[PDB]
Design a protein around this ligand. Structure first.
Ligand code: TTP
Ligand code: MN
Ligand code: MN
Length: 333
């Protein structure tokens, strides 16, 4: 017996069912490309169940008694076990719609809605996009300019080098300010599509105006290819960057997300930003459905009492929701 919510079970970085989960996640992704959010969540949940299993699924009798394994997901696994291939998955992979949506959505600054609009307007290739620059935001233009580098997986060695330059810029700008690696790398992943950093200072308010000073310093060093600063609107101050990472004899563009949070909200921001996306979806669903509380990256709110939970750590937040603590490396749902 394995719990239904991904936030109630450990999901390690590496598991025994990568072929099966990858097939399900292709179907999940394709459903998201078509706007079928329910079907996406269904396939994603089924894939995450396989990730938590302690052993490989070699016979279909091993699916018996597992949550989130309805008919469609079971059939996928069945065809894979019996034939080594699932024809729906292979049709999806080869389809022009999926390949194009995948191409466009992996461009920096392009979501599903934009990608689908461009598809419907007869755009197919990266060159087609380049021929219509009036259709692109500045962020999207930067993404296209650097798309080869931005499609190259980011390595832990890249992350280490980047964290050093970000730490130096932060340390110079404001003594005492801290940089915390979040995102998939904090969950132990060995590769990723970007690097995520969360910046704070232990005195509430000392972080005001820090990010722009950090960016000035990084810019002066030649380390920034693209930078979009956004002030908090509703809602953290952040900078969407492409860094020019020096390498032995060349350089690579790398996506970096810098997020500033006031230290009061830091444990919520850390939790939210550490992911995985599905784990956080599941944790927020759990908080709302099971405990009546709204969790987001800024706080945990009781909307009946009209109160906010004070947390000093991620552990406090788990405790408050009635969940066993999961370290970041077990949140790979
Ligand atoms: C869009 C959004 C994401 N997040 C979270 C969810 C993600 O788990 C987390 C990091 O985003 P990413 O950098 O997209 O995801 P990742 O680091 O888990 O994986 P990858 O290797 O592909 O980079 O940010 C928020 O907290 N608030 C938001 O508004
Ligand atoms: Mn990331
Ligand atoms: Mn990111």
């Amino acid at each position: 017996w394995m719990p239904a919510y991904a936030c109630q079970r450990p999901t390690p970085l590496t598991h025994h069912n990568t072929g099966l989960s990858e097939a399900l996640e292709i179907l999940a992704e394709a459903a998201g490309f078509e706007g079928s959010e329910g079907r996406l969540l269904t396939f994603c949940r089924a894939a995450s169940v396989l990730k938590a299993l302690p052993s490989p699924v070699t016979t279909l009798s091993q699916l018996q008694g597992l949550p989130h394994f309805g008919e469609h997901s079971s059939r996928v696994v069945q065809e894979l076990l019996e034939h080594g291939v699932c024809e729906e998955v292979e049709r999806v992979r080869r389809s022009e719609r999926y390949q194009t949506m995948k191409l466009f959505t992996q461009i920096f600054g392009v979501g599903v809605k934009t990608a689908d609009r461009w598809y419907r307007e007869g755009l197919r290739t990266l060159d087609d996009l380049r021929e219509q620059p009036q259709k692109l935001t500045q962020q999207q233009k930067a993404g296209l300019q650097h798309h080869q580098d931005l499609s190259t997986p980011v390595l832990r060695s890249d992350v280490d080098a980047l964290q050093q330059v970000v730490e130096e810029a932060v340390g110079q700008a404001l003594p005492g300010a801290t940089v915390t690696l979040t995102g998939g790398f904090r969950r132990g992943k060995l590769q990723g599509h970007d690097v995520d950093f969360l910046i704070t200072h232990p005195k509430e308010g000392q972080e005001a105006g820090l990010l722009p000073r950090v960016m000035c310093r990084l810019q002066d060093q030649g380390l920034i290819l693209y930078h979009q600063h956004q002030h908090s609107c509703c809602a953290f101050e952040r900078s969407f960057c492409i860094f020019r990472l020096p390498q032995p004899g060349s350089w690579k563009a790398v996506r970096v997300d810098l997020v500033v949070a006031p230290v009061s909200q830091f444990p919520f921001a850390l939790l939210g930003w550490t992911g995985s996306k599905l784990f956080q979806r599941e944790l927020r669903r759990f908080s709302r459905k099971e405990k009546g509380l709204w969790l987001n990256s800024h706080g945990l709110f009781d909307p009946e009492q009209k109160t906010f939970f004070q947390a000093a750590s991620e552990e406090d937040i788990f405790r408050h929701l009635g969940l066993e603590y999961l370290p970041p490396e077990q949140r790979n749902a």
